[PDB]
Amino acid sequence: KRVDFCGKGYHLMSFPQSAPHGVVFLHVTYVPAQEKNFTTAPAICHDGKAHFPREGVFVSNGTHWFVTQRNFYEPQIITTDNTFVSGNCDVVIGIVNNTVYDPLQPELD
Amino acid sequence: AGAALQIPFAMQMAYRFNGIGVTQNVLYENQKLIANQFNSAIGKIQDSL
Ligand SMILES: *[C@@H]1O[C@H](CO)[C@@H](O[C@@H]2O[C@H](CO)[C@@H](O)[C@H](O)[C@H]2NC(C)=O)[C@H](O)[C@H]1NC(C)=O
Ligand SMILES: *[C@@H]1O[C@H](CO)[C@@H](O[C@@H]2O[C@H](CO)[C@@H](O)[C@H](O)[C@H]2NC(C)=O)[C@H](O)[C@H]1NC(C)=O
Ligand SMILES: *[C@@H]1O[C@H](CO)[C@@H](O[C@@H]2O[C@H](CO)[C@@H](O)[C@H](O)[C@H]2NC(C)=O)[C@H](O)[C@H]1NC(C)=O
Ligand SMILES: *[C@@H]1O[C@H](CO)[C@@H](O[C@@H]2O[C@H](CO)[C@@H](O)[C@H](O)[C@H]2NC(C)=O)[C@H](O)[C@H]1NC(C)=O
Numbered sequence: 001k002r003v004d005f006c007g008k009g010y011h012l013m014s015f016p017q018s019a020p021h022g023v024v025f026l027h028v029t030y031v032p033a034q035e036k037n038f039t040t041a042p043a044i045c046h047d048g049k050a051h052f053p054r055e056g057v058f059v060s061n062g063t064h065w066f067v068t069q070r071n072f073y074e075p076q077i078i079t080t081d082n083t084f085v086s087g088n089c090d091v092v093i094g095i096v097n098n099t100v101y102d103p104l105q106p107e108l109d
Numbered sequence: 110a111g112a113a114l115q116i117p118f119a120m121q122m123a124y125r126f127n128g129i130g131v132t133q134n135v136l137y138e139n140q141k142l143i144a145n146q147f148n149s150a151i152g153k154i155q156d157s158l
Protein backbone atom coordinates (compact mmCIF):
# COMPACT_ATOMS: atom_id res chain seq x y z
CA LYS A 1 0.00 0.00 0.00
CA ARG A 2 3.07 2.27 -0.05
CA VAL A 3 2.55 4.79 -2.86
CA ASP A 4 4.93 4.38 -5.80
CA PHE A 5 7.02 1.66 -4.17
CA CYS A 6 5.89 -0.87 -6.76
CA GLY A 7 5.11 1.23 -9.85
CA LYS A 8 2.49 3.83 -10.81
CA GLY A 9 -1.10 3.00 -9.90
CA TYR A 10 -2.53 0.68 -7.32
CA HIS A 11 -0.14 -2.22 -6.88
CA LEU A 12 -1.69 -5.53 -7.85
CA MET A 13 1.31 -7.86 -8.04
CA SER A 14 4.96 -8.04 -9.11
CA PHE A 15 7.14 -10.63 -10.89
CA PRO A 16 10.94 -10.94 -10.67
CA GLN A 17 13.41 -11.71 -13.44
CA SER A 18 17.17 -12.10 -13.15
CA ALA A 19 19.50 -9.85 -15.11
CA PRO A 20 23.32 -9.91 -15.25
CA HIS A 21 24.44 -8.53 -11.85
CA GLY A 22 20.93 -7.32 -11.19
CA VAL A 23 17.21 -7.87 -10.99
CA VAL A 24 14.21 -6.68 -12.99
CA PHE A 25 10.78 -6.25 -11.43
CA LEU A 26 7.67 -6.32 -13.58
CA HIS A 27 5.02 -4.46 -11.58
CA VAL A 28 1.34 -5.02 -12.44
CA THR A 29 -0.85 -2.11 -11.34
CA TYR A 30 -4.44 -0.93 -11.73
CA VAL A 31 -5.00 2.47 -13.35
CA PRO A 32 -8.47 4.10 -13.34
CA ALA A 33 -9.82 5.37 -16.65
CA GLN A 34 -12.69 7.22 -18.35
CA GLU A 35 -14.12 9.29 -15.53
CA LYS A 36 -17.46 11.09 -15.45
CA ASN A 37 -18.41 14.04 -13.27
CA PHE A 38 -21.37 13.98 -10.88
CA THR A 39 -23.03 16.05 -8.18
CA THR A 40 -22.32 14.90 -4.65
CA ALA A 41 -23.31 15.48 -1.03
CA PRO A 42 -21.90 14.40 2.33
CA ALA A 43 -25.11 13.18 3.98
CA ILE A 44 -28.81 12.71 3.23
CA CYS A 45 -31.68 13.93 5.39
CA HIS A 46 -34.74 11.75 5.89
CA ASP A 47 -37.27 11.78 8.75
CA GLY A 48 -35.14 14.40 10.45
CA LYS A 49 -32.15 12.06 10.52
CA ALA A 50 -28.79 12.33 8.78
CA HIS A 51 -27.58 9.33 6.78
CA PHE A 52 -24.00 8.66 5.82
CA PRO A 53 -22.72 6.01 3.42
CA ARG A 54 -21.21 2.90 4.94
CA GLU A 55 -18.70 2.66 2.12
CA GLY A 56 -19.03 4.76 -0.99
CA VAL A 57 -20.19 8.23 -1.95
CA PHE A 58 -23.64 9.62 -2.65
CA VAL A 59 -23.79 10.79 -6.27
CA SER A 60 -26.50 12.30 -8.45
CA ASN A 61 -26.98 11.63 -12.16
CA GLY A 62 -28.96 14.86 -12.53
CA THR A 63 -32.26 13.89 -10.93
CA HIS A 64 -31.70 10.78 -8.78
CA TRP A 65 -29.36 9.87 -5.93
CA PHE A 66 -27.28 6.69 -5.60
CA VAL A 67 -24.45 5.22 -3.53
CA THR A 68 -21.38 4.03 -5.37
CA GLN A 69 -18.01 2.64 -4.43
CA ARG A 70 -15.36 5.30 -4.67
CA ASN A 71 -13.07 3.86 -7.36
CA PHE A 72 -15.41 2.25 -9.89
CA TYR A 73 -18.79 3.67 -10.88
CA GLU A 74 -21.49 1.19 -9.87
CA PRO A 75 -24.64 2.94 -8.65
CA GLN A 76 -27.18 1.46 -6.27
CA ILE A 77 -30.30 2.75 -4.57
CA ILE A 78 -29.95 4.18 -1.07
CA THR A 79 -31.33 1.81 1.57
CA THR A 80 -30.90 1.28 5.30
CA ASP A 81 -28.28 -1.39 4.58
CA ASN A 82 -26.24 1.03 2.48
CA THR A 83 -26.03 3.73 5.12
CA PHE A 84 -25.90 4.47 8.80
CA VAL A 85 -27.63 7.15 10.85
CA SER A 86 -26.17 9.73 13.18
CA GLY A 87 -27.84 12.83 14.57
CA ASN A 88 -30.40 15.10 12.98
CA CYS A 89 -30.08 17.07 9.76
CA ASP A 90 -29.23 20.51 11.16
CA VAL A 91 -25.48 20.28 11.72
CA VAL A 92 -23.99 19.00 8.46
CA ILE A 93 -22.99 21.58 5.85
CA GLY A 94 -24.40 20.64 2.48
CA ILE A 95 -26.95 18.00 3.50
CA VAL A 96 -29.53 17.07 0.88
CA ASN A 97 -33.10 15.79 0.97
CA ASN A 98 -33.92 12.34 -0.38
CA THR A 99 -35.71 9.15 0.57
CA VAL A 100 -33.90 6.22 2.19
CA TYR A 101 -35.57 2.93 1.38
CA ASP A 102 -36.36 0.27 3.97
CA PRO A 103 -36.79 -3.32 2.70
CA LEU A 104 -38.64 -4.80 5.63
CA GLN A 105 -41.85 -2.77 5.64
CA PRO A 106 -42.50 -3.20 1.89
CA GLU A 107 -41.92 -6.86 2.52
CA LEU A 108 -44.65 -6.66 5.17
CA ASP A 109 -47.04 -5.15 2.59
CA ALA B 110 -2.18 7.24 -9.28
CA GLY B 111 -3.52 8.45 -12.60
CA ALA B 112 -5.61 11.43 -13.62
CA ALA B 113 -6.63 14.06 -11.10
CA LEU B 114 -10.27 13.59 -10.10
CA GLN B 115 -11.90 16.45 -8.24
CA ILE B 116 -13.64 15.96 -4.89
CA PRO B 117 -14.74 18.61 -2.35
CA PHE B 118 -12.21 19.19 0.38
CA ALA B 119 -14.35 18.36 3.41
CA MET B 120 -15.25 15.08 1.72
CA GLN B 121 -11.53 14.38 1.22
CA MET B 122 -10.96 15.13 4.89
CA ALA B 123 -13.67 12.62 5.75
CA TYR B 124 -12.01 9.88 3.68
CA ARG B 125 -8.82 10.65 5.51
CA PHE B 126 -10.55 10.40 8.91
CA ASN B 127 -11.82 7.00 7.80
CA GLY B 128 -8.24 6.03 6.98
CA ILE B 129 -7.23 6.36 10.64
CA GLY B 130 -10.23 4.61 12.15
CA VAL B 131 -12.70 7.42 12.92
CA THR B 132 -16.14 7.52 11.36
CA GLN B 133 -16.80 10.41 9.06
CA ASN B 134 -19.75 11.83 10.93
CA VAL B 135 -17.13 12.85 13.50
CA LEU B 136 -15.64 15.11 10.84
CA TYR B 137 -18.89 16.47 9.45
CA GLU B 138 -20.28 17.28 12.89
CA ASN B 139 -17.10 19.15 13.91
CA GLN B 140 -16.07 20.71 10.60
CA LYS B 141 -15.85 24.27 11.94
CA LEU B 142 -13.79 23.37 14.99
CA ILE B 143 -11.48 21.16 12.95
CA ALA B 144 -10.90 23.98 10.46
CA ASN B 145 -10.30 26.52 13.24
CA GLN B 146 -7.71 24.17 14.74
CA PHE B 147 -5.94 23.64 11.43
CA ASN B 148 -5.84 27.40 10.84
CA SER B 149 -4.36 28.18 14.24
CA ALA B 150 -1.82 25.41 13.79
CA ILE B 151 -0.70 26.81 10.43
CA GLY B 152 -0.55 30.32 11.86
CA LYS B 153 1.74 29.09 14.62
CA ILE B 154 4.34 27.78 12.15
CA GLN B 155 5.07 31.12 10.53
CA ASP B 156 5.34 32.66 13.98
CA SER B 157 8.06 30.21 14.93
CA LEU B 158 9.71 30.81 11.56
C1 LIG C 1 -30.83 8.88 -13.76
O1 LIG C 1 -30.99 7.50 -13.65
C2 LIG C 1 -32.36 7.10 -13.55
C3 LIG C 1 -32.34 5.60 -13.37
O2 LIG C 1 -32.82 5.22 -12.09
C4 LIG C 1 -33.16 7.54 -14.78
O3 LIG C 1 -34.54 7.53 -14.41
C5 LIG C 1 -35.52 6.58 -14.91
O4 LIG C 1 -36.03 5.99 -13.71
C6 LIG C 1 -37.11 5.08 -13.90
C7 LIG C 1 -37.55 4.64 -12.52
O5 LIG C 1 -36.53 4.88 -11.56
C8 LIG C 1 -36.67 3.92 -14.78
O6 LIG C 1 -37.79 3.08 -15.04
C9 LIG C 1 -36.11 4.45 -16.10
O7 LIG C 1 -35.60 3.38 -16.89
C10 LIG C 1 -35.01 5.48 -15.84
N1 LIG C 1 -34.52 6.02 -17.10
C11 LIG C 1 -35.29 6.58 -18.04
C12 LIG C 1 -34.58 7.05 -19.27
O8 LIG C 1 -36.50 6.72 -17.90
C13 LIG C 1 -32.88 8.98 -15.18
O9 LIG C 1 -33.33 9.21 -16.50
C14 LIG C 1 -31.41 9.35 -15.09
N2 LIG C 1 -31.25 10.78 -15.25
C15 LIG C 1 -30.35 11.34 -16.05
C16 LIG C 1 -30.36 12.84 -16.10
O10 LIG C 1 -29.55 10.68 -16.70
C1 LIG D 1 -20.93 26.17 -2.66
O1 LIG D 1 -20.63 27.50 -3.03
C2 LIG D 1 -21.76 28.21 -3.56
C3 LIG D 1 -21.26 29.57 -3.98
O2 LIG D 1 -20.57 29.50 -5.22
C4 LIG D 1 -22.88 28.29 -2.52
O3 LIG D 1 -24.02 28.87 -3.14
C5 LIG D 1 -24.52 29.98 -2.37
O4 LIG D 1 -25.36 29.53 -1.30
C6 LIG D 1 -25.83 30.60 -0.47
C7 LIG D 1 -26.55 29.97 0.70
O5 LIG D 1 -25.62 29.60 1.71
C8 LIG D 1 -26.71 31.53 -1.30
O6 LIG D 1 -27.17 32.59 -0.47
C9 LIG D 1 -25.91 32.08 -2.47
O7 LIG D 1 -26.74 32.87 -3.31
C10 LIG D 1 -25.30 30.94 -3.29
N1 LIG D 1 -24.46 31.46 -4.34
C11 LIG D 1 -24.44 30.98 -5.59
C12 LIG D 1 -23.51 31.65 -6.55
O8 LIG D 1 -25.15 30.03 -5.93
C13 LIG D 1 -23.22 26.89 -2.00
O9 LIG D 1 -24.14 26.98 -0.92
C14 LIG D 1 -21.96 26.18 -1.54
N2 LIG D 1 -22.26 24.83 -1.11
C15 LIG D 1 -22.11 24.42 0.15
C16 LIG D 1 -22.41 22.98 0.42
O10 LIG D 1 -21.74 25.19 1.04
C1 LIG E 1 -35.34 19.40 3.19
O1 LIG E 1 -36.52 18.94 3.85
C2 LIG E 1 -36.74 19.57 5.12
C3 LIG E 1 -37.94 18.88 5.74
O2 LIG E 1 -39.13 19.62 5.55
C4 LIG E 1 -36.93 21.07 4.92
O3 LIG E 1 -37.11 21.69 6.19
C5 LIG E 1 -38.07 22.75 6.04
O4 LIG E 1 -37.41 23.95 5.63
C6 LIG E 1 -38.32 25.03 5.38
C7 LIG E 1 -37.50 26.16 4.81
O5 LIG E 1 -36.15 26.09 5.25
C8 LIG E 1 -39.03 25.40 6.67
O6 LIG E 1 -39.99 26.42 6.40
C9 LIG E 1 -39.74 24.18 7.25
O7 LIG E 1 -40.24 24.50 8.55
C10 LIG E 1 -38.79 22.99 7.37
N1 LIG E 1 -39.52 21.81 7.78
C11 LIG E 1 -39.22 21.11 8.88
C12 LIG E 1 -40.09 19.91 9.15
O8 LIG E 1 -38.30 21.42 9.62
C13 LIG E 1 -35.71 21.64 4.21
O9 LIG E 1 -35.89 23.02 3.92
C14 LIG E 1 -35.47 20.89 2.91
N2 LIG E 1 -34.29 21.39 2.24
C15 LIG E 1 -34.33 22.05 1.08
C16 LIG E 1 -33.02 22.48 0.52
O10 LIG E 1 -35.39 22.29 0.51
C1 LIG F 1 -12.71 19.87 22.42
O1 LIG F 1 -11.58 20.70 22.53
C2 LIG F 1 -11.74 22.02 21.99
C3 LIG F 1 -10.41 22.71 22.18
O2 LIG F 1 -9.75 22.90 20.94
C4 LIG F 1 -12.89 22.75 22.67
O3 LIG F 1 -13.14 23.96 21.96
C5 LIG F 1 -12.76 25.15 22.69
O4 LIG F 1 -13.56 25.28 23.86
C6 LIG F 1 -13.24 26.43 24.66
C7 LIG F 1 -14.07 26.33 25.91
O5 LIG F 1 -13.23 26.28 27.07
C8 LIG F 1 -13.51 27.69 23.85
O6 LIG F 1 -13.18 28.83 24.63
C9 LIG F 1 -12.68 27.66 22.58
O7 LIG F 1 -12.99 28.79 21.77
C10 LIG F 1 -12.95 26.37 21.79
N1 LIG F 1 -12.08 26.30 20.63
C11 LIG F 1 -12.54 26.29 19.38
C12 LIG F 1 -11.51 26.21 18.30
O8 LIG F 1 -13.74 26.33 19.12
C13 LIG F 1 -14.15 21.90 22.63
O9 LIG F 1 -15.16 22.51 23.43
C14 LIG F 1 -13.87 20.50 23.17
N2 LIG F 1 -15.06 19.67 23.10
C15 LIG F 1 -15.53 18.98 24.14
C16 LIG F 1 -16.76 18.18 23.90
O10 LIG F 1 -14.97 19.00 25.23
Ligand SMILES: *[C@@H]1O[C@H](CO)[C@@H](O)[C@H](O)[C@H]1NC(C)=O
Nearest residue numbers: 033034035036037038114115
Ligand atom coordinates in the same frame (compact mmCIF):
# COMPACT_ATOMS: atom_id res chain seq x y z
C1 LIG G 1 -16.36 17.70 -15.78
O1 LIG G 1 -16.85 19.04 -15.87
C2 LIG G 1 -15.82 20.03 -15.91
C3 LIG G 1 -16.46 21.42 -15.99
O2 LIG G 1 -17.19 21.68 -14.79
C4 LIG G 1 -14.94 19.81 -17.15
O3 LIG G 1 -13.88 20.76 -17.16
C5 LIG G 1 -14.36 18.39 -17.09
O4 LIG G 1 -13.59 18.15 -18.27
C6 LIG G 1 -15.50 17.38 -17.00
N1 LIG G 1 -14.95 16.03 -16.88
C7 LIG G 1 -15.68 14.96 -17.27
C8 LIG G 1 -15.11 13.57 -17.14
O5 LIG G 1 -16.79 15.13 -17.73
